[PDB]
Design a protein around this ligand. Structure first.
Ligand SMILES: COc1cccc2c(=O)[nH]c(-c3ccc(Cl)cc3)cc12
Ligand SMILES: [Zn+2]
Length: 208
């Protein structure tokens, strides 16, 4: 039941999603090993993901969380990078999209930094890179990220350098505690707590 609607670049919605993508790029502590070397992206396409069943699944769970947290869903817009983008947009998030080995346990991981999610497009640690050239820093091959609506509810704060949420909590927040430029990362343990709202097609750009 999924349909994808192209946004025109003249559309304010295209422009505000592109700006969130571009403005949350940072340098990474691997020097670009996992995700490539770049300071900005070439945005090729932005599509709205429309699936009524998956949306109602999201809003149902959002209401449950909100009612457990003084009518506050604590909803964010966050990036997700994955080799399974194309299954996610058709079937929704579930246990098969969890990062089993993540530092906050087996859950589904999201980032404020678009460049963090970019490290996972070709797999954990960037895998072996693009399928065509085996290059984690490929400037040619098209990449895709999701920009997702995520319900955090009461989030457990972890200060730092499928499983269950900590008791009394609906998510985990990974707060950066060394790299002063890093933005937060978040983990949910229920696939229903996220909706893949935008599919973004891009390339990383080689710095001049
Ligand atoms: C530190 O983890 C993360 C931190 C921040 C963001 C992400 C992210 O966007 N995706 C992923 C990810 C996706 C698919 C698999 Cl199979 C594994 C991991 C991780 C991840
Ligand atoms: Zn390539």
């Amino acid at each position: 039941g999924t349909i994808l609607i192209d946004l025109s670049p003249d559309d304010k919605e295209f422009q505000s999603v592109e700006e969130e993508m571009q403005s949350t790029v940072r340098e990474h502590r691997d020097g670009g090993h996992a995700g490539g070397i770049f300071n900005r992206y070439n945005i090729l396409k932005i599509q709205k993901v429309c699936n009524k069943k998956l949306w109602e699944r999201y809003t149902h769970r959002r209401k449950e969380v909100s009612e457990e947290n003084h009518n506050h869903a604590n909803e964010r817009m966050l990036f997700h990078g994955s080799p399974f983008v194309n299954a996610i947009i058709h079937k929704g998030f579930d246990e098969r999209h969890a990062y089993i080995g993540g530092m906050f346990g087996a859950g589904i991981y999201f980032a404020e930094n678009s460049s963090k999610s970019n490290q996972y497009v070709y797999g954990i640690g960037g895998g072996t890179g693009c399928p065509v050239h085996k290059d984690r820093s490929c400037y040619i091959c098209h990449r895709q990220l999701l920009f997702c609506r995520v319900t955090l509810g009461k989030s457990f704060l972890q200060f730092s350098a499928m499983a269950h949420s900590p008791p009394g909590h609906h998510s985990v927040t990974g707060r950066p505690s060394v790299n002063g430029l890093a933005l937060a990362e978040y983990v949910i343990y229920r696939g229903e707590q996220a909706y893949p709202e935008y599919l973004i097609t891009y390339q990383i750009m080689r710095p001049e």
